[PDB]
Design a protein around this ligand. Structure first.
Ligand SMILES: CC(C)CCNc1ncnc2c1ncn2[C@@H]1O[C@H](COP(=O)(O)O)[C@@H](O)[C@H]1O
Ligand SMILES: CC(C)CCNc1ncnc2c1ncn2[C@@H]1O[C@H](COP(=O)(O)O)[C@@H](O)[C@H]1O
Lengths: 130, 132
């Protein structure tokens, strides 16, 4: 019922519009805790960690390399959160071996998708596992 | 005694020469588990690195170039309780991730801004006086 969404901010805002589409679709399946990703660092880290601790599921869009997104994934793994990572191969980038290599059973999943299918992919995951 | 160094790879290799200098200087204070950063499959890479991280006495990360892997390593290392030094170079023109700078917490997670010419003496100082 509570969803933590990860997406690049200071790693770059190229995929901002897509993050907005992702958040909007995630709302059907839960309370999105991290709305800001779509739209004082001490405060932000604490606020977000509190949100992460209370989240039922963690969704990250991992196309744009980001320290913060990586960090949220690492903390989430260590909190035993179920994780879905969405990556876009058409971008031409190669996903971090630490994110792709983190894939493990149902608990940590990395999904490759084409941009126009992001909502359908989210529907697929939540129907199947949530 | 053993040190785990994090540096961007697939996030980009812009700062590779700085990674080489850091690894070089870290070899004065312990064995570096992750020297390859300064130069199987993703599953193997992840497991190998995670095993090294779990046994590391200290984690050092250069955090100027944004990187999923580096972030991930810092997240896993925080949960494990490993002492962390992050090195950020502001002359890059970048603003460091709020989740990295905000993670700073006493002796267990430090975030140091550095000028590129002083990076070695910064590492000397950390191991001399800022490492519990
Ligand atoms: C008061 C604000 C909304 C300030 C703006 N700053 C932020 N606010 C909320 N979450 C953030 C902020 N910066 C980074 N994050 C989190 O860290 C991730 C982005 O990391 P990055 O900035 O290193 O690329 C996102 O998934 C966010 O959840
Ligand atoms: C064909 C390649 C580019 C292979 C690189 N494969 C790798 N080998 C060893 N460690 C890695 C590798 N990729 C990521 N890492 C680790 O994760 C961090 C870099 O992640 P990044 O690729 O998301 O920037 C570094 O601190 C490394 O310790």
């Amino acid at each position: 019922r509570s969803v933590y969404f990860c997406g690049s901010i200071r790693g770059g805002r190229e995929d901002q519009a897509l993050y907005a589409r992702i958040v909007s679709r995630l709302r059907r399946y839960g309370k999105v805790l991290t709305e800001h990703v779509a739209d004082g660092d001490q405060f932000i880290h604490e606020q977000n960690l509190n949100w992460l601790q209370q989240a039922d599921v963690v969704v990250a869009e991992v196309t744009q390399p980001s320290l913060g997104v990586g960090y949220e994934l690492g903390r989430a793994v260590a909190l035993g959160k179920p994780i879905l990572c969405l990556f876009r191969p058409q971008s031409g980038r190669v996903l971090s071996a630490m994110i792709r290599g983190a894939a493990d059973g149902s608990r940590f999943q990395v999904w490759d998708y084409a941009e126009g299918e992001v909502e359908t992919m989210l529907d697929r995951y939540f129907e199947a596992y949530l």
